[PDB]
Symmetry: C2
Subunit: 104 residues, 2 copies
Amino acid sequence: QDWLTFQKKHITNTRDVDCDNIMSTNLFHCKDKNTFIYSRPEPVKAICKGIIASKNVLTTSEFYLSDCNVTSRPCKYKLKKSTNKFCVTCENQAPVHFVGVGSC
Amino acid sequence: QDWLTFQKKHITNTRDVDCDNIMSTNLFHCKDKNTFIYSRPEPVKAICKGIIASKNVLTTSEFYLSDCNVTSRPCKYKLKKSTNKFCVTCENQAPVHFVGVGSC
């Protein structure tokens, strides 16, 4: 019916995450906070290159990060966009957990 | 907990739509089929550059497209990935409806 509805129905990456739609999906289940990384999988998996034993690792470079943070209205959110380093748990050479922005 | 779950929860640009998550939202309500354009909205809005009066336009080039196609199990989906042209209804220099893949 209109540009914004066309985007929501028929476009997949405005690196301007749709907090209120994505966080109310059954994967995020109206949780307080989630951070999305604007990147292909490959540069992100590479963080864990040659780490086997469970270990927390900080990226050597910055990525575009979209944070969804819940307001006072249940399952309603405000989008924060930044570039920064982040920390993941590496297990058998792959990211298995998001630990934090800026610092492990 | 694992690389695959990490990607679904934190990676924005996987080229792989999470059909079973996305299609069971208010927006898609477990409908048989939806087509997603993998792009930022800018080159999609530009299709309608300087068209005011409602009109169907076929893209001049191909875009990465991802169809969610329902299985015989209600609201379980299979992803089909392709590149192709598509038709949109332009109104006031913006896409408002998705008419179809390959032709109007």
